[PDB]
């Protein structure tokens, strides 16, 4: 015992001077005659209304035009945003949803919660009726993520500290992956979608590769439980924010923190994050009740959207970079452009 | 157009289902319960109710003098608390049940209560104090086998108060020490001093009936508060 | 990377007194709220003492009352406990703690599921 944990602090320390051998500059030093962005403002162009609690979680479509919400109250909404039409209204069968997701071909979405259940919705049905098709089973704790690859494979994250992929048509896990050590509250997919990344409620984050199902990265920095994780557009980074009130930028290949996002007026910490189309906006959401826009490449904060009553929960931006959806605990969502 | 009247129809017929449902959803009260292992909740639940593998939360319904009521408990989780305890920041009231009879574990009770009491998420959120298991309690005080100051110096020196009024048959020692337990999570639940949350003791036992007209009397007093504090007359 | 190290403990007859000292890494130490754990032979984890950010609120549990003194080094980066007349009975593994959050007042950091921000513990035995 004594002689493992020895060779584990050898092994600790040499990875720590592997890694301080290499920062020969910053990226402040590089990014020194950068123009900067000036002021950014944006105004509300559609309030949509119908929700009778709190939000938790939202999603666009690929056509950038639909999207989907989940709110406490036990409902399920997809909405059209440019005329504000409800397209569907699903009702649950558990009311403590937590997350949601929407199929990349459009089919199908998806939903779980602290039932420790993800299921499956089918939308195009030849009788015109949306009707349970999967009840996935086997996590004990409940879930906190969940995103499609195709119509037919499943990735989640739980709070028993684990993330299973699943294969929907046959009903089992094809692959469990475990190593953390607290609870896991987000998870990312990359833009080739051969690789994730995972942050859980520990002080750290994890590089999984789908196919083999081991761990390649592991990535310390933060002090205090993270809770939203999201790719830089190339696939090379990652951005992180925590409970700590500061989010951070991480790199891959480099293997060591780049860029702290932070001010000393800030005491309250981060509940979601997002990029902009090119990477050269970091938007996040507080409890504060606003969301604030940075400079990705100089850590000078650019601009705020500051419209909501309550705590913000969810945060959007669509895939050709028009429009810009929150959704926060007052049970309203907002677009901005 | 010919194709946006159908779309306008859609949207007003799920309208009507929205607002027929906000109808219903509006009028009950939903209660969270909250306890150890060492307990009895279970038995509350049995009481209260004749009136799937891996299953992460319960449900239980009842309805006193035509109000509703909605009771979750927690099924299948791990030890950690911090996480999915902010789902219940809109509740009613949560149910807070300790063992009184072990002096072992009391102290871990009043730790807990304290780190509900001061959270962010559940500072408006008033709580339902039940005391079970209190003939075990009577009969260990009775028997002089353990003494309470040997976890509670404080107790020591305790007097019951001169204006109080004890129950009827009962021996002055149990009533010390009834007194002095109850009085220990009080101090806990006046010492903000707010008054925009309260805590309502009992003491039940394993064999008891009155539990449910308890909880819709205190609901009651709950509502009421609320409505005073609606109207800006506090 | 969060690192909590302590120091101390030992074998000591009954009626003794010694100090335990244990050092933090990897956090702005004057933000978050402190405690003193342990765990006896055959028991679960048990709650001993806490301080909060500043030192002007002190708590401890009944049956050390008169006994141990916890004290907080903010320069120095240490908290302190100061053990006088031992007991057979307070032979156990000792552990600090740090509160989850920072600019808070309340602890969820008892578990046995791996709490995260907590050390690997010291022996204390008394016995002669």
């Known amino acids: 015992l004594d002689q493992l944990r020895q060779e584990a602090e050898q092994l600790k320390n040499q990875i720590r001077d592997a890694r301080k051998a290499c920062a020969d500059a910053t990226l402040s030093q590089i990014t020194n005659n950068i123009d900067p962005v000036g002021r950014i403002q944006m105004r509300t162009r559609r309030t949509l209304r119908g929700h009778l609690a709190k939000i938790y979680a939202m999603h666009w479509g690929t056509d950038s035009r639909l999207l989907v919400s989940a709110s406490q109250d036990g409902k399920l909404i997809i909405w059209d945003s440019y005329t504000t039409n409800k397209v569907h209204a699903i009702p649950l069968r558990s009311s403590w949803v937590m997350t949601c997701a929407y199929a990349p071909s459009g089919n199908y979405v998806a939903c779980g919660g602290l039932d420790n259940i993800c299921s499956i919705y089918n939308l195009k049905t030849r009788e015109g009726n949306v009707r349970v098709s999967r009840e996935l089973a086997g996590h004990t704790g409940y879930l906190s993520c969940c995103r499609f690859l195709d119509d037919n494979q499943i990735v989640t994250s739980s709070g028993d500290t684990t993330c299973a992929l699943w294969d929907i048509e046959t009903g089992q896990q094809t692959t469990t992956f475990t190593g953390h050590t607290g609870d896991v509250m987000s998870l990312s997919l990359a833009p080739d979608t051969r690789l994730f990344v995972s942050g859980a409620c520990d002080a750290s984050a994890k590089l999984w590769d789908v196919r083999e199902g081991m761990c390649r990265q592991t990535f310390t920095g933060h002090e205090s439980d993270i809770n939203a994780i999201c790719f830089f557009p190339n696939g090379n980074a990652f951005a992180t924010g925590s409970d700590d009130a500061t989010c951070r930028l991480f790199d891959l290949r480099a293997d060591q923190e780049l860029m702290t996002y932070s001010h000393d007026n800030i005491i309250c910490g981060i509940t979601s994050v997002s990029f902009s189309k090119s990477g050269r906006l970091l938007l996040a959401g507080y409890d504060d009740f606003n969301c604030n826009v940075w400079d990705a490449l100089k850590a000078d904060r650019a601009g705020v959207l500051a419209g909501h009553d309550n705590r913000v929960s969810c945060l959007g931006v669509t895939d050709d970079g028009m429009a810009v959806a929150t959704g926060s605990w007052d049970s309203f969502l907002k677009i901005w452009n | 157009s010919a194709e946006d009247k159908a779309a306008v129809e859609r949207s007003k017929m799920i309208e009507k289902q929205l607002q027929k449902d906000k109808q219903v959803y509006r009028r009950t009260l939903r209660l969270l319960l909250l306890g150890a292992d060492n307990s009895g909740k279970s038995t509350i639940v049995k009481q209260m109710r004749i009136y799937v593998k891996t299953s992460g939360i319960f449900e239980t319904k009842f309805q006193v003098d035509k109000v509703n009521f909605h009771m979750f408990d927690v099924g299948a989780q791990r030890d950690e608390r911090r996480k999915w305890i902010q789902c219940f920041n809109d509740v009613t009231a949560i149910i807070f049940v300790v063992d009184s009879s072990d002096y072992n574990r009391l102290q871990e009770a009043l730790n807990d209560f304290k780190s509900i009491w001061n959270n962010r998420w559940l500072r408006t959120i008033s709580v339902i104090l039940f005391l079970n298991k209190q003939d075990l309690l009577a009969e260990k005080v009775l028997a002089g086998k353990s003494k309470i100051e040997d976890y509670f110096p404080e107790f020591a020196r305790y007097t019951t108060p001169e204006d109080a009024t004890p129950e009827p048959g009962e021996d002055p020692r149990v009533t010390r020490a009834k007194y002095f337990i109850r009085k220990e999570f009080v101090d806990i639940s006046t010492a903000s001093g707010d008054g925009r949350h309260i805590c309502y003791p009992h003491f039940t036992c394993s064999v008891d009936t009155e539990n449910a007209r308890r909880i819709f009397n205190d609901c009651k007093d709950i509502i009421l508060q609320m409505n005073l504090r609606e109207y800006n007359l506090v | 990377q969060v690192q909590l190290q302590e120091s101390g403990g030992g074998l000591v007859q009954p009626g003794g007194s010694l100090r335990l000292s244990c050092a933090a890494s990897?956090?702005?130490?004057?933000?978050?709220?402190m405690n003193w754990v342990r765990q006896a032979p055959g028991k679960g984890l048990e709650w001993v003492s806490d301080?909060?950010?500043?030192?002007?609120?002190?708590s401890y549990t009944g049956s050390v009352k008169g006994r141990f003194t916890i004290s907080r080094d903010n320069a120095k980066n240490t908290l302190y406990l100061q053990m006088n007349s031992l007991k057979p009975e307070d032979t156990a593994v000792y552990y600090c703690?740090?509160?989850?959050?920072?600019?808070?007042?309340?602890?969820?950091?008892?578990?046995?599921?791996?709490?995260?921000?907590r050390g690997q513990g010291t022996q204390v035995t008394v016995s002669s």
């Open positions: 703690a740090r509160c989850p959050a920072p600019f808070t007042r309340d602890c969820f950091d008892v578990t046995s599921t791996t709490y995260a921000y």
């Open positions: 301080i909060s950010q500043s030192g002007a609120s002190i």
């Open positions: 990897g956090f702005t130490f004057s933000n978050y709220k």
